[PDB]
Symmetry: C3
Subunit: 357 residues, 3 copies
């Protein structure tokens, strides 16, 4: 039988419970309108899956080890990705060749060939088993490998000029849920701007060219100490865009920070360095290499974003849930009514029809 | 007191509101079955945290600078990860040596030694302060650095053969939530297929071998212009799988796009190139280098996914929400019944027991 | 009129339905405290958008091709990012120069110059169009390019010492929603620890030093086969932290797996290799190169996390959803009471006030 059910309802008219319920209903409606709808923007579909593309180019010259260094000297790797390192400090060990030689660290002090056993395996090459004089004051164990051994201890200068190098970022973003593409290079960017512009979070926040010193500062870092220890700085590019607004309002927000924080809270591993070698070989077949322990700043360009565009489906579902939530005040209103007018028994009686068996 | 409450209910038996409520209930149930259950598949848990592993290897040979280039020549970096560049154009500066030489851009045109001060610091090398004859017609400032300077301007030809190179992708995906592993190499892939296979959206859509010229076509790009300007193309691999279906139905979808979108929309930065150097030294200790400004296409293999497998918790909660939602039609049915039969007062009286105090 | 509505309610007092509904409600309340609050911890806000930074350094020395190899030889690329390879096997092609020579894979077999045409376009260099003796028993097609060609086929030994190398991971994590930073190097880590510590999932789970052999074992892989074929292992770093608990309890969880899983279930591409060349050039300007096919284990340092901390808003909304969901049992209790107490007719009459017109 096609029958429509619906509850039998009391309709109290006390001025007290009347205004207090109307106030609870007003607060519920305003909370859902201002928060769930305006702020949290539940009326639009959200896309967090951003497509990004970063192309970088470093520019500048520096003085180091009686050489003039250009980008190709101090940037590694060079293909211009969202991660690159700018070498600021280098410990060079020139012209290593395969042979036999003693270690240079005081950690390998010896007086007899009997001590040079399978105990200290890492570092350099393989122990030859002999104990050989490294200097007039020190004897260390002999190893086969790349000779002469590097000295890790003597500090070398840093390339101050790197502070004035320039990082150019080319970022292409696409939100697929809305098929919306934009880049951090607006159409009104000119060649003249590019040759001279200067990024600043306030004075020029759209200039694709970032001064390394500016970035180091923005992360609160001291160029001298950082270029001495090496480290990683993160350049974050945020694309929080409400596409219901104007197209030209989808705009990139720059952030700057230091990513390798653990290094400062450690006296044992304070920075970031890596070792690599330039390989040459003579007219004779023998090979030799220049071994460089490089200290520098690694840069990660981190591009995130989320875009929301209005659709009717989330709007409908949110309005349905809003109407279904306006009712929740009935329980609190029940408590107030049934326990705060002295004649509470009247309402308990009006509402409750007991049964027993 | 162990008491079970339940409300007193009117049960109208009007054929009109009876059928309109029964139809509203059918619409809610059908929307829940077709959309919530079938389409949005709320009966299964979704895992988006896919683990992916990409290994690439390029193949091909080409003529450039009267040389035959193989992979180790035009592929960079070489370790073959989900990112690589295939160089299509090279502006080469052979045999750079650290020394003194004049700049070559008209941007450094001068007549007096006073113009070359510490003002235009970046680029090339460091100004020595003199103004030196660069050619019979032009005078430019001198620099200390890698000599002679690179000339940026004369366009060089492109490696046409790059169009016919082959990109082999090896992709492994794993869903931990369901402990399901699968890869883009189907078990029915043979050595003979590999020896001849062919990626194509229709004729062979599983061949791990993709023609570069094909990929360029698939993003809607003209190979000539792309090899001239450089750019970034994204090869996307999708693993959208309904694990309730068959194991061999979890299949990867290839899509092709160009990621450096701003490049065509820019008159200032139209492509993707970078500069690097081959490092040599004579039998003499003297160092010299070959400088390459490389233009090529970057490939990032982008693997995303989400898999759904049935579990009892999502079905239980969806069915609970359905039963809690069947009641929603009553507000509409209340308004229609209580305000559109002239004797609405009968139902207001049957339903509403007013109160006053 | 500021009026408060509320429904009229039956209040059954049967002992049977009293305890059966109270038990349903007890099960609902206990499920909500134990599951939604204790287990799923809905009383706290979650952030999964973790910011992370990894810096790695490998150490060890090994014998290969009768040379001692250190970090600068076998780690690639070397900048110590979250991805690096420890080359374990090399197929070397010494002293290639630009020229004419026949192919070395049997795939190029010929007897007549008519077979080496523009038919088999890919591979090696450019077919010269002639057919030349590659061996006394075999003839292959001649190509223009780097000569003599590499042989892919002769099996080479592996670098056994690679098993005893050490990988040092330095991970910094940042939860921005709670602005909480920490690193996997606890402040009570000493130099002595670093010099002698030993990672083990049980005995010392915080020593940043991982033996490559240990990593191979934990991912359930045999060093010999991995090192012969090459592959990808994933080192995942997890930060599941309940900030409500102790601060020093935010601890990284290490897991080990092999990522290139398809390699083992496939007869086509069983491992991981790539090719690169050491570039030289003679006293004459002419270039020659040493070509290396590199087999190794790739390492991905994979850092995920989610942090949850108590907030008043999630607790409030969960308690609200709990109180609004306790009502759901009334439908089952309606069914039971109205159809399983013999006096069901009593309750049907007490509850339902029929109407007809
Ligand atoms: N680090 C940097 N500092 C300042 N300007 C830069 C930097 N990198 C690029 N630019 C400028 O941005 C513009 C576009 O960059 P892009 O490198 O794509 O062009 P390009 O002609 O290859 O540049 P160049 O010839 O200067 O290497 C160029 O005019 C270049 O001068
Ligand atoms: N692979 C490894 N195995 C064992 N210990 C390591 C390893 N890598 C680094 N360490 C230790 O941790 C510290 C980290 O040093 P870091 O790489 O930051 O600069 P470094 O002091 O120049 O390193 P090193 O002296 O080892 O070349 C080192 O002093 C070293 O003792
Ligand atoms: N870009 C490519 N184009 C065509 N075939 C390829 C490509 N990359 C790999 N292959 C083939 O796919 C298979 C998987 O390659 P893999 O590198 O694992 O084997 P390989 O023997 O080292 O290959 P190669 O013959 O290049 O040495 C090989 O048989 C190789 O011939
Ligand atoms: O709430 C977001 C919503 O977006 C999409 O829904 C589509 C639907 O899939 C299409 O068939 C279309 O007809 O209706 C909606 C229009 O936006 C997603 O498919 C869906 O998963 C999601 O709920
Ligand atoms: O193939 C074995 C598979 O059977 C079941 O899968 C069902 C699935 O649950 C349904 O949604 C249906 O439409 O498709 C399948 C039947 O072909 C279960 O998943 C399980 O028993 C098993 O994995
Ligand atoms: O999920 C967390 C939630 O945090 C933020 O909400 C804040 C709000 O911004 C503050 O004004 C604070 O007083 O109230 C909330 C605390 O939870 C974000 O606004 C919001 O997007 C985010 O969901
Ligand atoms: C940066 O450039 C300015 C002007 O060219 C100069 O005063 C300053 O010393 C430079 N910075 C460094 C670290 O050399
Ligand atoms: C380019 O136009 C945008 C549009 O609002 C504006 O923000 C920007 O200032 C313009 N560019 C310059 C260099 O002023
Ligand atoms: C190769 O010749 C060079 C001289 O060019 C010499 O120094 C070197 O020792 C020779 N190689 C060997 C293994 O002796
Ligand atoms: C690419 O291959 C086609 C046939 O596949 C051939 O006709 C064409 O000439 C090749 N392109 C180049 C630049 O050699
Ligand atoms: C391999 O299997 C897939 C589906 O598993 C099928 O589409 C494809 O055609 C098969 N390939 C061959 C060569 O049979
Ligand atoms: C590695 O060291 C262990 C113990 O230190 C030893 O059992 C093994 O022989 C060593 N292997 C190599 C290749 O050095
Ligand atoms: C350092 O502290 C951690 C946690 O507080 C502890 O697990 C570890 O045992 C401590 N280190 C040593 C060497 O005891
Ligand atoms: C370059 O010189 C080398 C010997 O140093 C010789 O083998 C080669 O044929 C020469 N090539 C040219 C083009 O001069
Ligand atoms: Mg040291
Ligand atoms: Mg230029
Ligand atoms: Mg081969």
């Amino acid at each position: 039988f096609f029958t429509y059910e619906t509850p039998k309802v009391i309709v109290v008219k006390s001025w007290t419970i009347g205004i207090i319920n109307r106030v609870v209903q007003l607060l519920i409606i305003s909370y859902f309108v201002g928060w769930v709808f305006l702020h949290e923007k539940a009326y639009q579909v959200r896309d967090t899956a951003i497509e990004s593309s970063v192309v970088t180019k470093v520019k500048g010259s520096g003085l180091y080890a009686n050489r003039v260094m250009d980008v190709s000297d101090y940037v590694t790797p060079p293909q211009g990705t969202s991660v690159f390192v700018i070498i600021t400090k280098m410990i060079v060990t020139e012209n290593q060749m395969q042979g036999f030689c003693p270690e240079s660290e005081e950690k390998y002090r010896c007086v007899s060939d009997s001590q040079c056993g399978p105990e200290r395996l890492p570092g350099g090459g393989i122990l030859t088993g002999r104990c050989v004089n490294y200097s007039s004051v020190l004897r260390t164990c002999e190893i086969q490998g790349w000779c002469p051994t590097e000295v890790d201890t003597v500090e070398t200068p840093i390339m101050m000029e790197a502070e004035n190098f320039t990082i150019f970022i080319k970022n292409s973003i696409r939100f697929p849920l809305f098929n919306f593409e934009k880049g951090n290079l607006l159409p009104n960017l000119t060649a003249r701007d590019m040759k001279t512009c200067r990024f600043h979070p306030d004075k020029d926040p759209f200039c694709p060219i970032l001064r390394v010193g500016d970035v180091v500062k923005f992360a609160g870092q001291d160029f001298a100490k950082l270029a001495r220890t090496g480290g990683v700085l993160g350049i974050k590019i945020g694309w929080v865009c409400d596409l219901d607004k104007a197209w030209d309002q989808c705009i990139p927000k720059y952030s700057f920070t230091r990513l390798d924080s653990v290094s400062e809270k450690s006296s044992v591993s304070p920075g970031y360095n890596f070792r690599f070698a330039k390989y040459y070989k003579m007219e004779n077949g023998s090979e030799y290499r220049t071994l460089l322990k490089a200290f520098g700043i690694r840069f990660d360009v981190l591009v995130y974003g989320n875009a929301g565009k209005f659709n009717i489906i989330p709007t409908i579902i949110s309005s349905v849930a809003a109407f279904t939530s306006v009712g929740v005040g009935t329980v609190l209103c029940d408590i107030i009514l049934l326990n705060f007018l002295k004649g509470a028994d009247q309402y308990k009686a009006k509402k409750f029809e007991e049964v027993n068996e």
